[PDB]
Amino acid sequence: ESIGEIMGKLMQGEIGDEELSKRIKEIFGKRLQWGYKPTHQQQLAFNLDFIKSLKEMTYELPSAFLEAAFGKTIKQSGCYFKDETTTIDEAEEASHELYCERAQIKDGQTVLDIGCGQGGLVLHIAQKYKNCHVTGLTNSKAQKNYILMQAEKLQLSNVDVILADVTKHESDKTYDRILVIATIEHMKNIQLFMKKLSTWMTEDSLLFVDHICHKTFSHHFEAIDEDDWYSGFIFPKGCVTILSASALLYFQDDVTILDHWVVNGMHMARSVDAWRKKLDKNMELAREILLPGLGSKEAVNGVITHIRTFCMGGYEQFSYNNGEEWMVAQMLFKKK
Ligand SMILES: C[S@@+](CC[C@H](N)C(=O)[O-])C[C@H]1O[C@@H](n2cnc3c(N)ncnc32)[C@H](O)[C@@H]1O
Numbered sequence: 001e002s003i004g005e006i007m008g009k010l011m012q013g014e015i016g017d018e019e020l021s022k023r024i025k026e027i028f029g030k031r032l033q034w035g036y037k038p039t040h041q042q043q044l045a046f047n048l049d050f051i052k053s054l055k056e057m058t059y060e061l062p063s064a065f066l067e068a069a070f071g072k073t074i075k076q077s078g079c080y081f082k083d084e085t086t087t088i089d090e091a092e093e094a095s096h097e098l099y100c101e102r103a104q105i106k107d108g109q110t111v112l113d114i115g116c117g118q119g120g121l122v123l124h125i126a127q128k129y130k131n132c133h134v135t136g137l138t139n140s141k142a143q144k145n146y147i148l149m150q151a152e153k154l155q156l157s158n159v160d161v162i163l164a165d166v167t168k169h170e171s172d173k174t175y176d177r178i179l180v181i182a183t184i185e186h187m188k189n190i191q192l193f194m195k196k197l198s199t200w201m202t203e204d205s206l207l208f209v210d211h212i213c214h215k216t217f218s219h220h221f222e223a224i225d226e227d228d229w230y231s232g233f234i235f236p237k238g239c240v241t242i243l244s245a246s247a248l249l250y251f252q253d254d255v256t257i258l259d260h261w262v263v264n265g266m267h268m269a270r271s272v273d274a275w276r277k278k279l280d281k282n283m284e285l286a287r288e289i290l291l292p293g294l295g296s297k298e299a300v301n302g303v304i305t306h307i308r309t310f311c312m313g314g315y316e317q318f319s320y321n322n323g324e325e326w327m328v329a330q331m332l333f334k335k336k
Pocket residue numbers: 074075076077114115116117118119137138139140143164165166167181182183186
């Protein structure tokens with residue numbers, strides 16, 4: 001009935017799943033009411049106001065726990081599910097192929113994957129295109145280590161990984177292909193981000209961006225009101241922005257759009273659902289893995305509760321109206 005009340009009950013496994021889902025669904029429904037305007041005139045005013053506001057602006061989970069929660073390549077982004085029996089591992093790969101098709105990857109190209117995570121796309125491209133030089137860029141020591149280790153086991157010679165904050169990283173190097181998957185959501189300054197990317201491109205390069213979106217409006221991932229315990233739980237900072245499907249159309253100072261797609265949010269929902277189910281299946285192993293690094297069974301339960309609530313929440317968000325509210329947007333660009 002209040003902030004701490006719900007949080008207390010949540011950490012103590014006293015909120016059932018059906019209730020938790022229902023609570024979170026309500027929260028997102030209120031986000032919808034906040035975002036939809038009665039006329040397109042007003043909707044544009046709202047969206048443009050947000051776009052204009054944009055132009056003014058240490059602990060790492062064990063990889064072993066990650067393997068117990070995510071799919072094989074530990075994709076930390078929306079996958080693509082062909083069939084109702086598609087496993088998370090298949091969906092991972094489907095998603096990878098889609099990106100390769102849409103980014104127009106060809107054997108022989110230099111490829112840069114900014115915010116490359118545990119490197120599932122770096123690894124996919126490298127294995128499928130033996131003549132591409134694939135660079136991952138990441139700000140995490142542990143991710144760089146995991147990718148390099150996987151490249152070694154897979155007998156891959158065409159992989160390097162830059163350890164850098166992209167917002168600080170400087171280089172003369174250019175690339176045939178730049179891929180940005182689930183990373184723009186974290187970018188403080190998009191206009192300046194897009195500008196940097198353009199400098200790492202030539203007249204021949206293509207830029208492919210994928211981000212979670214709403215079809216109609218943008219929002220920060222944060223509490224609207226006092227009843228929203230979820231937003232602040234999941235993103236304790238709240239430097240996750242959710243751009244509208246079309247927000248990036250407004251950021252063509254330095255790049256030019258060539259194509260634009262969205263993927264229905266049921267794919268994302270099935271992604272988080274799989275992560276959740278798999279986490280549940282491996283609940284005990286997960287606790288054992290985390291206990292060393294956390295040194296407290298309560299600290300572990302804390303870290304697990306949060307990852308699970310994220311999945312449970314993500315499921316309500318992306319499945320809303322059969323995936324026709326929150327979904328994933330994709331764009332292809334060339335340099336000016
Ligand atoms: C949601 S994960 C996406 C991971 C991967 N691209 C995937 O599709 O599974 C976001 C990624 O961006 C990275 N990242 C966040 N801020 C960054 C920054 N300033 N510089 C470089 N990488 C950053 C994170 O460490 C992580 O690898």
